[PDB]
């Protein structure tokens, strides 16, 4: 198992998410896994991709020096809530490395 | 809580164990043992040669786990050699059977 | 018409005898023609002998080759190819510059089996190989059957084309056709590809009758000594 | 199937083969409603090696993986000057290459 | 099912519903070859009872059970005057909706 | 001259029904010539010599040149809720590493609830 870091928002406007950056892997995603089936749907990932809904409010900045990657999301709405994950490899499910939760008190 | 007895990656067997407390007494503390194998289904017989027939039989001698192999590992590269006739020049070249894991 | 073909990475990486070719066609036959090569700074390089014979339909067909360092090509130095003919006193100058390399990316290789409906006809089966999302272009693809390479004339390869969903990305196709009996004899076919991004420069995928969307999952799960001695 | 593990996109390919002469026309639609023409690409008629003068073509379409999983069907239509109705359609969905049957056989023993 | 336990013939029906106006055209072709109009019949546009200002038709095709157990996609083309390009077709075969079947054979010991 | 084979056994099931104590037995066999002694350490700390009682080397029922010995130790019943594993050890000259630490714990032993959960997929080609 791997950590279950949790973050909150304290009313909308901005939010910041951090996950560990593995080595020797080129793909990095933050799929939301908020589906009844459970199959995680990649939201924002490298190798060129993005979410039909999440556009212009999502960006990724990988930092090998700190062994971390940073994703910045502007504003906030009702849809982009729940939980989120992080990982690598070429299999969104079975390749996760964290389970973060997103909530807003607004 | 659960300790790990086997973490084989070639056979994906994760043998573990745990003892559950009884109903507020030190007696009949039944022990447990969890086994979880994940069959590949789409892998070949000779995992490093993409010509052998498909893998039908799966034999698991649990004693050995706690050499023919079944699955690949997320931390290794598999390679082979193939003939290329570019310009009528048969030539052997190393081919990354499992790419993205040879970087 | 003066045609120039730059060397391909599939030729460089496989022969290490790289050269660049300028050829002339659709031109009245006239001996005593000079082929030269010019860089951006005016230096001349050696042009090779053994010029190609003229085409039977009374037109030119010539070969001119020279060797330039691969590091020089990677430096992005503009080069010019010139040919001289008395018909056109002004020599024709054409550029064979190599534009270094744009962001490199690996080509995903998906190989698909023939359609079920096609096999219903029991005539012939077609196997495809969809390379996808490689930048830049010039991927090289080949097919072999059970460890034996096939003729280049038994399959057709497309050319890199833009990708609407991904800016600055390219994709290509390739199809092989064989009889139904061959597909139904467990014969195995593979689609090797070659690209600069590839870590080993070569990768391959393979399918057969049993692996291409099978109708049966025959399994023989067998375990023993489950108790055993585990520590 | 591998393309699906990335949970990003999906590529359905429509393959037209054997026609003669050239100038075929391919369009994509679902549930009878035509699809936007900026989401698919079609190749020009290309000669067939063995065939004396027959040609072939191929078109691909990219959709979201979710959409594929949702269960939506996507039909492909071709219009050539030789078909008796001059129009033909085909259809594929999640239920196309499902394994028809399983034949598992567990033989658990302690010896 | 009970029709097939006779080994003489089977009938395939092509229900068409909810169109307007009348004069729909239905014909049956096998693997791209249209079949003779004598091998099948066709109903006439008759009103839809619960749905007002509507019509529906029918068509059946007789076929030997010997060849139905071998393939023969047997598509049913319809030509109305309100379709996106005026023509549509569907097909069904012996394995149109066969489901998955499990054969577990535990040798528990 | 053969490797001295060694074994260890846990307390009896019916022994854990009076709530007084428990015994753990470390059996040492072989070691020809007979040169062994056992020291019962727990967590790397040797126990008092008054607890474990080694007796003597004894020839095996059929003894060409082989021998054997038995050594037990007494613990408290209420301490087995945590185990502590009560390690045993042997020493002999006919051993490449001259130590064969042997230890068992409540967890080690016979299982009473097997829970096999095998799964079948087509994306298990690589073990993540
Ligand atoms: C499985 O495939 C491997 C690779 O082809 C076989 O081992 C190779 O054997 C060739 C000669 O036949 C050697 O040139 C290679 O060096 C071998 N590979 C390695 C990694 O040493 C292997 O024998 C095959 N197994 C079976 C059962 O056929
Ligand atoms: C299915 O497995 C059995 C053994 O369990 C074997 O006899 C048979 O040949 C297999 N089927 C095929 C098509 O190989
Ligand atoms: C199905 O499984 C049985 C039992 O292993 C076997 O005898 C039979 O051959 C299998 N059938 C096929 C087609 O593999
Ligand atoms: C179904 O299982 C039985 C019993 O093992 C076997 O005899 C039969 O061949 C199996 N059928 C198939 C299609 O595998
Ligand atoms: C048996 O294994 C399954 C799968 O891991 C688990 O959900 C279940 O809780 C286990 N039962 C016990 C008693 O541990």
Numbering used by the authors:
A (entry chain I): 19 to 124
B (entry chain J): 3 to 68, 98 to 134
C (entry chain A): 346 to 576
D (entry chain B): 461 to 571
E (entry chain C): 461 to 569
F (entry chain L): 449 to 576
Show sentences the authors wrote.
FcμR is the IgM antibody isotype-specific Fc receptor involved in the survival and activation of B cells. In this study, we image a complex of the ectodomain of human FcμR and the IgM-Fc pentameric core using single-particle cryogenic electron microscopy (cryo-EM). The analysis reveals multiple binding sites for the N-terminal Ig domain of FcμR on the Cμ4 domain dimers within the IgM constant region and provides a framework for understanding FcμR’s role in immunoglobulin recognition and signalling.
Two binding sites (position 1f and 3f) which have highest occupancies of FcμR, reached high-resolution (3.5 Å and 3.1 Å) in the cryo-EM maps, thus allowing the atomic model interpretation of the FcμR Ig-like domain and the IgM binding interface. Due to the quasi six-fold symmetry within the Cμ4 domains in IgM pentamer, the FcμR molecules at position 1f and 3f share almost identical interactions with the two Cμ4 domains (Cμ4-A and Cμ4-B) in subunits Fcμ1 and Fcμ3 respectively. CDR2 of FcμR forms additional interactions including Lys69, which form a hydrogen bond with Glu526 on Cμ4-B chain and Asn66, which contacts neighbouring Cμ4-A chain (Gln510 and Arg514). In addition to the common features, different interactions between FcμR and binding sites at subunits Fcμ1 and Fcμ3 result from the asymmetrical structure of IgM pentamer. The same residue Arg112 in FcμR at position 1f, on the other hand, interacts with Thr571 and Thr574 at the tailpiece in subunit Fcμ5 (chain B) extended from the other side of the IgM-Fc core. The interactions with the tailpiece residues may provide extra stabilisation for FcμR, directly reflected in the high occupancy at position 1f.
